[PDB]
Amino acid sequence: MSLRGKTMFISGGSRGIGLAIAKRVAADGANVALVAKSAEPHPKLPGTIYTAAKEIEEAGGQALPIVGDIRDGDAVAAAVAKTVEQFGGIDICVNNASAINLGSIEEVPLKRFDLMNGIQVRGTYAVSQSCIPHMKGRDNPHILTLSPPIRLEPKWLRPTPYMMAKYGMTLCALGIAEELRDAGIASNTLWPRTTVATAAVQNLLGGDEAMARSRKPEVYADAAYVVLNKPSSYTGNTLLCEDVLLESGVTDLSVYDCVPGSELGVDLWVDSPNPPGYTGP
Amino acid sequence: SLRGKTMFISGGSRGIGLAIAKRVAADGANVALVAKSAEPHPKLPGTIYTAAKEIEEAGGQALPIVGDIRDGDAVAAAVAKTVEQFGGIDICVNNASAINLGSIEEVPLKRFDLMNGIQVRGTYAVSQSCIPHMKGRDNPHILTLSPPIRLEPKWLRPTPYMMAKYGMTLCALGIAEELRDAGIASNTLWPRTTVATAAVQNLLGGDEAMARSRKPEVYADAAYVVLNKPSSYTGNTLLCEDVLLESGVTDLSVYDCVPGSELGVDLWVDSPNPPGYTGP
Ligand SMILES: [Cl-]
Ligand SMILES: [Cl-]
Ligand SMILES: [Cl-]
Ligand SMILES: [Cl-]
Ligand SMILES: [Cl-]
Ligand SMILES: [Cl-]
Ligand SMILES: [Cl-]
Ligand SMILES: [Cl-]
Ligand SMILES: [Cl-]
Ligand SMILES: [Cl-]
C-alpha cells in the first residue's frame, strides 16, 4: 500500500511535525493542501505555507498552500472547497493545528483559553466537519488528529486549559469515529511518547544543540504514514507513535532519537518513553 | 447547614438550577443568579426576577443579574456585583447548559459554539472568576452539573453535545487538582434518570406526569449533600441517587414523578438506580 494519487487536507503543516507528515505523504506522490492563518514569515519560527509548499513539491507531491484562519468557519469552508476544486476529493484529513499554554485556570486568561479551545477543539470540529462530505466516496478515507489518549487519573488532569483543549480534540476524533463508522471514514488520534524537537526549538534556544531527551519529527511522520495506510475499519483508536511503529515492524526506535543512547524524556500524558517491553537500541 | 453562605449560580432561573437555589436558600443563604436576558420566554417558565422572588420566599436573599456567560466581562461584572453585595463566595454552581443531539454532520458550527461557549468556555469563565473570592472561606465548593467521563464507544455520541458536557466535566476535574492546595472543592453531579421539569410539561402542552422521570428535588437534595461535605471531597464525578443513598436515604421513590413505574435512564448512565438498591 501507498498514498499515490491521494489527497490530504492538513491544518498547520507549515513547520515541524505537520511539515514532516506532509512531506512523508507527499513522497508517495500525494496531493497536500495546507491551511494557516498567515503567510508572513515569523521572525523566530521557521517556515511559511509557501516554503512548506516548495518542500512538499521537492519531496514529490503537489502542494496547495491556503491562507485561512481555522477559527473562522467560513475560511475553513473556503479552504476545503478550494482543495476540492483543485484536487477533486479528500482522502486524508489531519488535524494538527495547535496552541499551548501550560498555566493553571488561575494563570490563563479567557483570551488565551479561547485561542486554545478555538484552534484545537472548535478547529478540529470545523475542519473535520467540512472535510467529511468530500471523503465519503473514497477508497480508504482517514481522519487523524494529533492529540493524546484520555487519561483520567488525577495527575493527568492538569494543567486545565491545555488538558481541556487536547482532550477535547481527542473526544472529537473518537466521537467522529462512531458517527462516521457506517460511512467508512476512519478517525484516530496519534501522540508521541517523548517530546519532539523541531527546528523551532533550536531557533528559540538560540543554538545548534542536541535535544538528548527528545525524538525527531519523523517519529510522528512515520507513525502517521502507517495509520493512514490501514483500512478504514481501523478506527476509534487513541494511538502512540512508538507503539504504532513497533506493531508495524520497526525494531530499532533509535533512528528517531535526536541523540541515541540517551535517557529519554516523556511527553505529557505518557508514562514511558518507549512501548512496554521494548528492548531495541 | 448552609446558613449565611453565599452561592453564585449560572442557569438558576428554572428547573434543576432553581430547585438547587431554593434548597440552598432555605437555610438562609444568599444566592446570586445570572442569565443572558431577564425577558420572559413564551414557552419556558421563569425569569431571573421570578426565580429571585421564589428564593426569598424559600428563606434566602437573592441577587438576580443580567449577564451573558459567553461574554467574559459580563461574567466578571456579575461576580464583582455578587461580592460587593454579599462579600465573598462559598459556592459556585455551573448549570447554564445547552443541548442538541445531532451528529457532527447535523450540528453546524454556530450551534456547536452555543454548546461549547455556554458549557465549556462558560464553566471555565464562571469558575475562574469566582475562585479568588472563595479562597478565604470555611468550606468552598464548586459544583458542575455534568456527567462522568465514559470512554466506551457507545457513550461517545452525539459528538457535539458529548464534547460539551465532557469538556464541562474535564474543567471541573482539572480545577479540582489545581485548586486542591487552596483547597476549593470541585465536583460534578449528574442524575441517573431524566429529570422532568415545568418546562417539559409546558412544551407538551399538558400537565401530565412523566412516569419514566424523576423530580428536580433529586438534583437539589443531592447537591445539598455534596455542598455540605468537607472541601477535601473533590475531583469526583457523582450521580445524584448514589450520593443520596450514601448520605442515608433509603427511599428514592419520593423523587419519582410516578412511584412504582419502570424508570428511564439519563445519558451516560446504565441504570436508573444505584447498584443493589432494593428500596421502593
Ligand atoms: Cl481575557
Ligand atoms: Cl494520580
Ligand atoms: Cl523540524
Ligand atoms: Cl503510558
Ligand atoms: Cl518495560
Ligand atoms: Cl441548528
Ligand atoms: Cl462563545
Ligand atoms: Cl461500546
Ligand atoms: Cl451507571
Ligand atoms: Cl444491581
Side-chain angles (χ1 to χ4, degrees), chain A residues 2-39 41-53 55-84 86-207 209-281, chain B residues 1-2 4-52 54-206 208-280:
Chain A
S2 191
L3 306 171
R4 196 154 182 81
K6 301 230 168 297
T7 294
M8 176 158 80
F9 190 89
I10 185 174
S11 68
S14 99
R15 69 181 106 277
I17 295 171
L19 187 59
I21 288 158
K23 276 155 86 185
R24 183 70 165 88
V25 175
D28 277 14
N31 315 319
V32 176
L34 54 169
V35 68
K37 170 146 149 72
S38 178
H42 195 272
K44 288 182 158 300
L45 311 181
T48 70
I49 52 180
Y50 301 117
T51 74
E55 289 191 58
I56 286 155
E57 293 173 342
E58 283 165 348
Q62 257 46 68
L64 185 66
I66 304 169
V67 164
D69 191 347
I70 187 172
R71 278 166 313 160
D72 175 353
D74 295 327
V76 169
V80 162
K82 203 192 175 188
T83 298
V84 167
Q86 182 72 49
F87 294 125
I90 296 169
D91 290 295
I92 303 166
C93 176
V94 172
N95 296 298
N96 164 65
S98 70
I100 189 155
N101 175 323
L102 303 182
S104 81
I105 180 157
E106 299 188 280
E107 297 164 331
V108 172
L110 205 49
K111 179 183 247 267
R112 176 62 58 167
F113 176 95
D114 291 344
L115 175 158
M116 293 195 264
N117 180 78
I119 292 173
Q120 283 158 146
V121 184
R122 191 176 178 267
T124 295
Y125 184 86
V127 161
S128 296
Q129 178 187 67
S130 174
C131 282
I132 280 159
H134 305 286
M135 306 177 80
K136 282 187 180 162
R138 315 287 293 169
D139 281 348
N140 185 49
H142 267 266
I143 306 176
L144 189 68
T145 297
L146 274 35
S147 65
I150 308 297
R151 297 269 234 151
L152 297 175
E153 304 86 7
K155 55 164 144 197
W156 304 121
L157 295 172
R158 222 171 172 176
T160 299
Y162 188 59
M163 175 271 297
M164 282 172 66
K166 295 311 295 192
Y167 280 19
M169 273 181 91
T170 292
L171 288 173
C172 187
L174 299 181
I176 289 173
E178 299 314 303
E179 292 182 335
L180 277 45
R181 192 176 287 277
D182 284 359
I185 301 156
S187 186
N188 295 288
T189 66
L190 184 62
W191 194 244
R193 281 189 172 262
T194 74
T195 48
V196 176
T198 66
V201 170
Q202 302 298 112
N203 280 8
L204 290 166
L205 257 183
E209 212 174 55
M211 298 283 88
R213 306 210 90 216
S214 299
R215 283 187 164 129
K216 301 192 272 165
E218 280 85 352
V219 80
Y220 231 139
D222 286 353
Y225 186 80
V226 170
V227 172
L228 296 171
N229 281 285
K230 291 278 210 218
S232 295
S233 56
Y234 183 84
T235 194
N237 299 110
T238 61
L239 301 161
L240 292 175
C241 294
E242 288 88 332
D243 305 43
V244 166
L245 286 163
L246 291 180
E247 284 154 9
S248 80
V250 176
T251 60
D252 180 8
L253 294 161
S254 290
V255 299
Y256 302 108
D257 299 5
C258 297
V259 179
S262 296
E263 218 73 21
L264 290 167
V266 291
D267 196 5
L268 297 185
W269 300 298
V270 168
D271 284 318
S272 306
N274 294 322
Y278 172 68
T279 306
Chain B
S1 171
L2 305 172
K5 302 277 159 262
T6 290
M7 169 186 264
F8 184 95
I9 182 167
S10 62
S13 259
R14 72 182 51 98
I16 289 157
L18 179 62
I20 292 163
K22 284 169 56 171
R23 182 72 181 83
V24 166
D27 281 5
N30 310 310
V31 182
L33 60 157
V34 77
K36 176 167 177 189
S37 174
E39 296 294 309
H41 187 276
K43 286 190 166 83
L44 303 176
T47 70
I48 55 167
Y49 302 111
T50 257
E54 290 200 46
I55 284 159
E56 292 173 336
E57 288 167 345
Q61 287 276 300
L63 187 68
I65 308 178
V66 171
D68 196 355
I69 190 182
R70 300 168 85 189
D71 176 352
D73 294 311
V75 168
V79 168
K81 193 177 168 71
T82 293
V83 169
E84 175 207 19
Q85 192 72 64
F86 302 125
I89 303 172
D90 302 287
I91 297 165
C92 181
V93 171
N94 293 297
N95 181 42
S97 75
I99 182 160
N100 184 319
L101 305 178
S103 76
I104 182 151
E105 300 187 282
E106 299 165 331
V107 176
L109 200 60
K110 176 190 200 27
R111 188 87 209 175
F112 174 95
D113 291 350
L114 211 37
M115 301 189 274
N116 182 77
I118 290 174
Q119 285 166 129
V120 178
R121 192 181 181 272
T123 294
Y124 186 91
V126 167
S127 302
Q128 173 181 76
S129 181
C130 287
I131 280 168
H133 304 279
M134 309 177 69
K135 281 175 176 199
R137 319 284 298 180
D138 290 339
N139 200 47
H141 274 263
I142 303 172
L143 192 65
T144 298
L145 310 187
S146 61
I149 304 298
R150 312 208 51 186
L151 294 183
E152 298 79 14
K154 60 149 153 187
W155 302 125
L156 297 171
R157 61 210 196 100
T159 303
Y161 184 58
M162 174 279 292
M163 288 177 59
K165 296 309 301 192
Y166 280 23
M168 219 166 152
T169 293
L170 291 166
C171 188
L173 291 183
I175 294 168
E177 298 307 314
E178 291 179 336
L179 274 296
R180 187 186 293 282
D181 292 346
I184 297 160
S186 196
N187 297 288
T188 71
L189 181 59
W190 194 248
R192 279 191 173 263
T193 78
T194 59
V195 174
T197 63
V200 174
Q201 327 285 128
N202 279 9
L203 290 162
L204 273 175
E208 113 152 285
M210 305 263 89
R212 311 211 82 214
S213 293
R214 290 190 157 127
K215 298 192 267 182
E217 281 74 10
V218 78
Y219 226 139
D221 280 359
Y224 188 84
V225 173
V226 172
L227 289 177
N228 280 271
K229 288 189 153 268
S231 297
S232 49
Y233 196 65
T234 189
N236 303 284
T237 59
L238 301 167
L239 296 173
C240 291
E241 289 96 331
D242 305 54
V243 166
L244 283 163
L245 295 194
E246 202 189 38
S247 72
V249 173
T250 59
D251 184 0
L252 291 169
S253 65
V254 299
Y255 298 111
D256 297 4
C257 297
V258 177
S261 311
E262 224 71 315
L263 294 169
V265 293
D266 200 10
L267 295 184
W268 300 296
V269 174
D270 293 301
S271 308
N273 286 323
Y277 170 70
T278 41

